């Protein structure tokens, strides 16, 4: 049921989650945004996995641009037409010059990437910590073993 009203409604509740008109949202805040959304564009409340799969790009730090969210929500409901891809590019230029605030043009991270990094990181911290316990344990027992022998 895509319509004229939905687009004003997406741009409306943007002020609810961003009154300051930053055009960027903290990734953690995003999940609730899409939950409290218009019926066609809405994504069901358990939506962390979808957000991850969407790969919305995030600028430093953990800030996703207004448009990326928008087009990704539409091209979820709608097919990925060439015109949309072209349309967003034209819109991007309009938004940047329009924005009074100035920031770097490119963001180096996306949600999919971020999730792999968090996974890979846990694995390393988990391993590092376990390796440490073993060394301590080995050192304590050996010390006790030699001391007892003495």
């Amino acid at each position: 049921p895509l319509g004229e009203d939905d687009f004003e409604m997406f741009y409306e509740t943007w002020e609810k989650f961003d009154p300051d008109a930053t055009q960027f949202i903290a990734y953690s805040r995003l999940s609730d945004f899409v939950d409290t959304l218009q019926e066609p564009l809405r994504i069901a409340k358990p939506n962390k996995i979808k957000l991850i799969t969407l790969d919305l790009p995030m600028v430093p730090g953990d800030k996703i641009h207004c448009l990326d969210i928008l087009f990704a929500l539409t091209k979820e409901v709608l097919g990925d037409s060439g015109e949309m891809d072209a349309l967003k590019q034209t819109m991007e230029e309009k938004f940047m010059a329009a924005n009074p605030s100035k920031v770097s043009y490119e963001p180096i991270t996306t949600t999919l990437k971020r999730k792999h990094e968090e996974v890979c990181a846990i694995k390393i911290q988990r391993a590092y910590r376990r390796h440490l316990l073993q060394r301590s344990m080995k050192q304590a027992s050996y010390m006790y073993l030699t001391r007892a022998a003495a």
């Binding site: 799969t53 999919l112 890979c120 990181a121 694995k123 911290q125």
Partner: protein
């Protein structure tokens, strides 16, 4: 034992949610992450965890694979990927900054002193940087 979290992982590689993982879905996820697999490579990957010759992978087979990796083998191939991820700029060395930045991420609040000891014991060469060889040695045994 709790399988609560492994379902999230299965969902990531299932785009349509048909309860199975094809080559194409798996390849899609790899490419997005920064790696190009050959078409043949995707097939072999699928085969290893493919018990019933189906050619795709549902939660049983996926669960078995997770269980097999449950032991903390910490294989070099698994580690190699982590290095690739943390080496943000691709120069073959992990600078302190890169690793230090990883600590901020949620997995564990490694203290700055703990992170410094990680770098001290790993940087054999003595050039403020972890290469692949030092990183592997640090994480092996």
């Amino acid at each position: 034992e709790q399988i609560a979290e492994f379902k999230e992982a299965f969902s990531l590689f299932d785009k349509d949610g048909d309860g199975t993982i094809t080559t194409k879905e798996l390849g899609t996820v790899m490419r997005s992450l920064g790696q190009n697999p050959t078409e043949a490579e995707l097939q072999d990957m699928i085969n290893e965890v493919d018990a019933d010759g189906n050619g795709t992978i549902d939660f049983p087979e996926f669960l078995t694979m997770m269980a097999r990796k449950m032991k903390d083998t910490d294989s070099e191939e698994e580690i190699r990927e982590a290095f690739r991820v943390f080496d943000k700029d691709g120069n073959g060395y992990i600078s302190a900054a890169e690793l230090r930045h990883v600590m901020t991420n949620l997995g564990e609040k490694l203290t700055d002193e703990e992170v410094d000891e990680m770098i001290r014991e790993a940087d054999i060469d003595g050039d403020g940087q972890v290469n692949y060889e030092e990183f592997v040695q640090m994480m092996t045994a």
